[PDB]
Design a protein around this ligand. Sequence first.
Ligand SMILES: *[C@@H]1O[C@H](CO)[C@@H](O[C@@H]2O[C@H](CO)[C@@H](O[C@@H]3O[C@H](CO)[C@@H](O)[C@H](O[C@H]4O[C@H](CO)[C@@H](O)[C@H](O)[C@@H]4O)[C@@H]3O)[C@H](O)[C@H]2NC(C)=O)[C@H](O)[C@H]1NC(C)=O
Ligand SMILES: *[C@@H]1O[C@H](CO)[C@@H](O[C@@H]2O[C@H](CO)[C@@H](O[C@@H]3O[C@H](CO)[C@@H](O)[C@H](O)[C@@H]3O)[C@H](O)[C@H]2NC(C)=O)[C@H](O)[C@H]1NC(C)=O
Ligand SMILES: *[C@@H]1O[C@H](CO)[C@@H](O[C@@H]2O[C@H](CO)[C@@H](O[C@@H]3O[C@H](CO)[C@@H](O)[C@H](O)[C@@H]3O)[C@H](O)[C@H]2NC(C)=O)[C@H](O)[C@H]1NC(C)=O
Ligand SMILES: *[C@@H]1O[C@H](CO)[C@@H](O[C@@H]2O[C@H](CO)[C@@H](O[C@@H]3O[C@H](CO)[C@@H](O)[C@H](O)[C@@H]3O)[C@H](O)[C@H]2NC(C)=O)[C@H](O)[C@H]1NC(C)=O
Ligand SMILES: *[C@@H]1O[C@H](CO[C@@H]2O[C@@H](C)[C@@H](O)[C@@H](O)[C@@H]2O)[C@@H](O[C@@H]2O[C@H](CO)[C@@H](O)[C@H](O)[C@H]2NC(C)=O)[C@H](O)[C@H]1NC(C)=O
Ligand SMILES: *[C@@H]1O[C@H](CO)[C@@H](O[C@@H]2O[C@H](CO)[C@@H](O)[C@H](O)[C@H]2NC(C)=O)[C@H](O)[C@H]1NC(C)=O
Lengths: 203, 203, 203, 214, 108, 216
Amino acid sequence: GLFGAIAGFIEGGWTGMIDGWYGYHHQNEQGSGYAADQKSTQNAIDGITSKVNSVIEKMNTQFTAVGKEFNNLERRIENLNKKVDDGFLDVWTYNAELLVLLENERTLDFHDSNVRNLYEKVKSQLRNNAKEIGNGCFEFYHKCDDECMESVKNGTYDYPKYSEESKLNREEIDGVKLESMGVYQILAIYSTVASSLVLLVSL
Amino acid sequence: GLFGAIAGFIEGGWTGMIDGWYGYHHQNEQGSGYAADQKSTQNAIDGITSKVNSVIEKMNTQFTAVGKEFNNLERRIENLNKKVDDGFLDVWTYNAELLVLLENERTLDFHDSNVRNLYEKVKSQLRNNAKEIGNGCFEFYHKCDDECMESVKNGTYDYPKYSEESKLNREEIDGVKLESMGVYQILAIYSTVASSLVLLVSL
Amino acid sequence: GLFGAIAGFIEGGWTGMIDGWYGYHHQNEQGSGYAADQKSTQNAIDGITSKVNSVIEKMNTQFTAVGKEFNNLERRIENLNKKVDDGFLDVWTYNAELLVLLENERTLDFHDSNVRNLYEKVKSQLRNNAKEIGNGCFEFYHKCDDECMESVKNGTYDYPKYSEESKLNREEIDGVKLESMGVYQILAIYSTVASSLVLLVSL
Amino acid sequence: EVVMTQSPATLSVSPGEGATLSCRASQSVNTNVAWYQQKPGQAPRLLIYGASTRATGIPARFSGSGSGTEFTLTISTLQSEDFAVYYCQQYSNWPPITFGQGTRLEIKRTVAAPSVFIFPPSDEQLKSGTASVVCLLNNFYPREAKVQWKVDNALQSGNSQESVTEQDSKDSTYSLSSTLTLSKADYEKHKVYACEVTHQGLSSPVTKSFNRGE
Amino acid sequence: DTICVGYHANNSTDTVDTVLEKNVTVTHSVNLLEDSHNGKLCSLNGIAPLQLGKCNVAGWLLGNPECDLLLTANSWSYIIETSNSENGTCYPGEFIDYEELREQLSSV
Amino acid sequence: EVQLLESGGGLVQPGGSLRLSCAASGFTFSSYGMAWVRQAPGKGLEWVSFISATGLSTYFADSVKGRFTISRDTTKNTLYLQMNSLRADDTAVYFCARMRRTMIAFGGNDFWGQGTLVTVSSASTKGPSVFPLAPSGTAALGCLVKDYFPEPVTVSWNSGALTSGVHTFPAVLQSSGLYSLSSVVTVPSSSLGTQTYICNVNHKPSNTKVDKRVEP
Ligand SMILES: *[C@@H]1O[C@H](CO)[C@@H](O[C@@H]2O[C@H](CO)[C@@H](O[C@@H]3O[C@H](CO)[C@@H](O)[C@H](O[C@H]4O[C@H](CO)[C@@H](O)[C@H](O)[C@@H]4O)[C@@H]3O)[C@H](O)[C@H]2NC(C)=O)[C@H](O)[C@H]1NC(C)=O
Ligand SMILES: *[C@@H]1O[C@H](CO)[C@@H](O[C@@H]2O[C@H](CO)[C@@H](O[C@@H]3O[C@H](CO)[C@@H](O)[C@H](O)[C@@H]3O)[C@H](O)[C@H]2NC(C)=O)[C@H](O)[C@H]1NC(C)=O
Ligand SMILES: *[C@@H]1O[C@H](CO)[C@@H](O[C@@H]2O[C@H](CO)[C@@H](O[C@@H]3O[C@H](CO)[C@@H](O)[C@H](O)[C@@H]3O)[C@H](O)[C@H]2NC(C)=O)[C@H](O)[C@H]1NC(C)=O
Ligand SMILES: *[C@@H]1O[C@H](CO)[C@@H](O[C@@H]2O[C@H](CO)[C@@H](O[C@@H]3O[C@H](CO)[C@@H](O)[C@H](O)[C@@H]3O)[C@H](O)[C@H]2NC(C)=O)[C@H](O)[C@H]1NC(C)=O
Ligand SMILES: *[C@@H]1O[C@H](CO[C@@H]2O[C@@H](C)[C@@H](O)[C@@H](O)[C@@H]2O)[C@@H](O[C@@H]2O[C@H](CO)[C@@H](O)[C@H](O)[C@H]2NC(C)=O)[C@H](O)[C@H]1NC(C)=O
Ligand SMILES: *[C@@H]1O[C@H](CO)[C@@H](O[C@@H]2O[C@H](CO)[C@@H](O)[C@H](O)[C@H]2NC(C)=O)[C@H](O)[C@H]1NC(C)=O
């Protein structure tokens, strides 16, 4: 089953990333990104390697097999021999092609699940101060440097260090401050006017 | 694996929808819905058609096979012949039944993944102005006509056309306006009262 | 495909839970939790039982088979007999090992899908008044007793009973009330001052 | 910080021909290079992005190539309007964003000799206290010329400025002015002043001189 | 500042067949099928084969006099007949149980 | 149709402050990042600053940190840049510009403004001075324009009836803080006797026309 990530809500892959299959792309105060994630791709490599080695070691090697001989009065046994050899040959080639054709969707859905889980982790440990925008990116209500980049990448974000300050910038963005505009609707008028009653009586 | 959509958080299917497997149901200012989504069901049809054609073309057709004859002194070869035929027959019927019994959950989980991905797309391009309610529906803080219905359906929603106006209606719903109630707690009292000190001195 | 729940965003299992595979853990006013969910584990038990019974009943039992005899002038038929028996033996042991090695990831991903769907249900019927915290827990802006615990567990939460009162406690937590602090920025100063103009004129 | 470098400094070309320019980097950007041209007194306009895909509304005689650290812009033909200033830009690693150094494009014609003149200061400049001498060159190709300023056959430094016109549409040759600006005392001190011109079209360095009071 | 999440891409053009699709371009792959072979006939574990040449096994065991060359051989790895191995029995007759003799021969 | 209009220029005393504004028309201003690039006179380009699409990310060049701020208004579709405590080396022509995409690798800038002139220097508005460049016995004659602080001037020759061999050199800043240029005319060598040549200099900031006839 297509889990939705590869060629889904995430666009196609990255040419510039080299040393892995799963990486990040940061844009802090002093650089750009393209750094790998050596945890999850290691488990991916180990799983696929165990997979291929198992598929190799299940198929047994065959020993010597030589075609036999018959005279003109043993045609029946020869036809039986040909039926045996062709039947076993058809069974083995059917098993091989069917094994490959199931294993391919198995490994492609495995990669798709890896992408989606690595995305859900990054979203789940950035539960408010992120502002997702589309196709797997985040935009960071607070300020972040390389230290908190690697703090995201090792999964140790220590979120309540930033939680109030991020909140401040979030209240800048939409807020109720545009509804407020700085003063009250017009009450400061009435209090200029409650000072005007003073002037009019104390003339 | 049951991905959760069919007979899950979404209730059962729709009788009135005709021309597809995946559709929408809109209720704009001038009509009701039941329109299909010809993109995703086309890929579904093509995938299942390639699947069935592959399963057909892997099985080879068999040529002529006629039962043979033996006298009373060749019982050994005849028992060998019967063992050969029954063994191949059992292997072929086992492979056929096992192939069908795996292919059925493959295609059912394929349909389940299609439902869940088509739901995640509609949610992801309606990231604020939607107000989901349950069993795969949305309720649209702004106003929408047939043009923005097809703008949802082609996946081109151009969200920042509506983003402030939707926000206005969202601030109507819960807001802080019910906490505000129109004036201040009682400060307008003190400013009536700061006008009352005027009256009492300037008597 | 690893759906992400078991040994993923949820930590390892619970020793103290006994009578099922899928349960809850509540901490209301008068107790702790560890109660099972007899709906979903029943479907899990029935599915796995049908699975194992199908795998049993597909394999046929074999009847009597006795090794045969040959003299020194029928070596050809004997070599054919040995090739037949070893070929069928290799095909059957290959099918058995491959069947088990696919069925194991099938059932493990089945359990993973069950965990993730049971989590999504509890989140989806607690759409605001929950405050998720991490590794599959919720923290309940309103007050709940054992009755609403079983109301969650049977899936009948009747949410709009609590919706305003929960909102009250949510406005306690972050709010705009800390920005408000109790009075206005300094306007009450001007209205003390608009009462001070009274004093200065009416001296 | 990826520092870019354009090459060459200035390209000369005859019309109906091609051109090629190289932009190099300090590290390896992948393909993320764009180019721009700019008419004098105008905003720059987009040409090519990613070194392969031409922008919308661009004629097909432009092309680009390159990867790694070196990139190349190529113009097939000309119609005497593309002579502008050219800029390469990376966008791989930023902030900050770094541009090239600017590369103009010249029209090539026959190497011609300047007409050289000199102008002594008017005496109302000495009434104001100004001493302004103008050494003037007109109608010369190429751009390079050498002016040596001599005070009784002795070189000065830091008292002469210069101004160069643009490329005329008729002859494609240039015009140069050099200005000596001094006080009264040095002009009334020495007598024989000269500007000596070493130009590629000239056979010899030509000396234009004048006396004090002429 | 942000952290976009993505995956590897490459320039490889090799295609893998699958159930729901034909010709899926993959980044890395591995072959599991052999096609290359020499045109040579070498020895099994360092023991040379026995080439009969133009001789049949019957003419070799009987000692067909035109099979005079391979008179001194005693050991091999396997026996090579050719498409011109027609020098068997010079005098006409019937070598009875030739096939069973070949089957007994193939384990010595 | 997409264009960018920009304003806020003018001569300002050093150490002062400016508020440049770039308005946009023809597209959705709330769906793209924006950037500022300056150009020194007679030099190449120089990127100044960047603001993201939602405005959550702001970036500045390293040489100009702490002296410049930037903001945007959605309803006005307007970009504002505040300059504080300027220096003499920041006289340039400024450009507001739009990114082409919204990724990190944005892929160039497709739309631009048209440049506002900002001069940061400490001087007063001064009218120029005109001096003749008289032929000794030669075939050329000119006029020198000196000591005017704001650009530009305009030098005509007998009310524009003389367009051959009339070279007007571009101006140059002198070290005292004023501008100077010259205009030269090539004549025949026997034309010194009869033909009349008058250069006319017009300075629009100080609003002064000077008429000057050149003669040996
Ligand atoms: C080892 O193998 C070789 C290869 O087969 C074999 O030599 C062949 O022997 C046969 C048998 O004699 C030859 O066949 C005949 O050759 C003669 C020439 O001598 C032809 O005239 C024959 O034509 C017909 O006429 C004959 C006279 O009536 C008949 O006797 C005959 O049956 C035909 O009807 C016929 O071609 C064959 O030519 C050779 N070939 C070669 C190229 O060697 C050799 O005999 C084998 N060794 C031993 C010891 O048997
Ligand atoms: C995962 O990433 C986090 C990011 O916070 C790592 O923690 C940081 O590790 C670095 C390692 O160099 C520490 O930097 C240096 O530490 C030394 C020793 O105190 C000090 O002399 C330096 O000045 C510098 O700080 C850093 O202190 C540390 N902590 C923080 C908050 O940045 C973490 O090690 C990574 N790995 C794991 C397994 O978590
Ligand atoms: C996907 O849906 C969008 C919905 O916005 C489609 O865009 C709209 O397409 C219709 C096609 O009829 C356009 O309607 C008509 O256009 C003509 C030509 O301008 C005009 O004369 C009519 O008055 C009417 O507007 C419509 O303009 C267009 N845009 C919008 C904003 O509605 C889109 O074509 C669909 N397909 C794809 C591949 O995106
Ligand atoms: C799923 O859980 C809900 C939880 O609300 C169950 O509803 C509650 O069921 C209990 C069963 O004992 C009811 O408790 C008792 O009802 C009797 C009869 O009215 C009364 O005499 C007692 O005082 C006590 O209330 C309870 O009323 C009922 N409702 C609520 C709101 O708690 C529900 O039955 C469970 N099962 C299903 C299939 O929904
Ligand atoms: C799948 O591909 C094979 C090989 O085709 C080549 O590689 C493909 C990725 C694509 O680039 C093709 O254009 C290439 O030719 C196809 O097999 C060939 O198909 C063509 C017609 O498409 C036919 O003329 C040939 O005889 C076939 N075989 C080869 C090896 O030449 C196959 O058809 C492709 N199938 C689909 C559905 O695309
Ligand atoms: C895909 O790109 C890679 C670059 O990583 C190409 O590999 C290069 O191939 C040439 C030709 O032999 C070598 O000289 C280089 O050393 C290789 N690069 C590296 C990093 O090893 C590869 O050839 C490209 N694919 C195709 C089909 O051309």
